[PDB]
Amino acid sequence: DAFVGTWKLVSSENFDDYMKELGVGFATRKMGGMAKPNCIISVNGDVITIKTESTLKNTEISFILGQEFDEVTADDRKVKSTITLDGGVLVQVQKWDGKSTTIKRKREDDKLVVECVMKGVTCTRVYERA
Numbered sequence: 001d002a003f004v005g006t007w008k009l010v011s012s013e014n015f016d017d018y019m020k021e022l023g024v025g026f027a028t029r030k031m032g033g034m035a036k037p038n039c040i041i042s043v044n045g046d047v048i049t050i051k052t053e054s055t056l057k058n059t060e061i062s063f064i065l066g067q068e069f070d071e072v073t074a075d076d077r078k079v080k081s082t083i084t085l086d087g088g089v090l091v092q093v094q095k096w097d098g099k100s101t102t103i104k105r106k107r108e109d110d111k112l113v114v115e116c117v118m119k120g121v122t123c124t125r126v127y128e129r130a
């Protein structure tokens with residue numbers, strides 16, 4: 001939709017703090033810190049797919065809005081995820097071991113803006129069309 005496309009990461013603020021707050025260890029945080037992934041968003045019928053591609057790590061989810069799904073995250077957490085569309089924002093929550101984190105994806109001007117929150121840490125990552 002407004003989201004459909006191939007998106008390249010162009011900026012990131014506070015991602016190391018976000019990963020630390022999730023409990024990611026040094027080696028895995030090193031792999032994520034300077035990565036500049038592509039995010040490929042597609043839709044078919046009821047199913048939305050978000051691919052994340054980077055040199056040292058690829059991930060993929062496919063989901064239906066409002067339907068919980070199991071997810072293995074890039075840092076190897078086993079989480080329960082639910083994604084909804086609220087005011088044009090794709091809102092994802094991951095729940096595991098009594099914790100939660102949110103990942104909100106929105107379109108702003110030429111940007112796909114992704115806000116990631118864990119506790120008091122907020123990370124902002126911006127992608128632009130490849």
Ligand SMILES: COc1c(C)c(C)c2onc(C)c2c1C/C=C(\C)CCC(=O)O
Pocket residue numbers: 019024028029031032033035037039052054057073074075103114116125
């Ligand atoms: C790049 O992918 C990685 C990697 C490589 C590492 C090590 C990671 O460790 N923890 C996480 C989480 C993580 C991610 C996904 C990034 C996000 C969900 C941020 C929002 C976005 O930009 O989609």
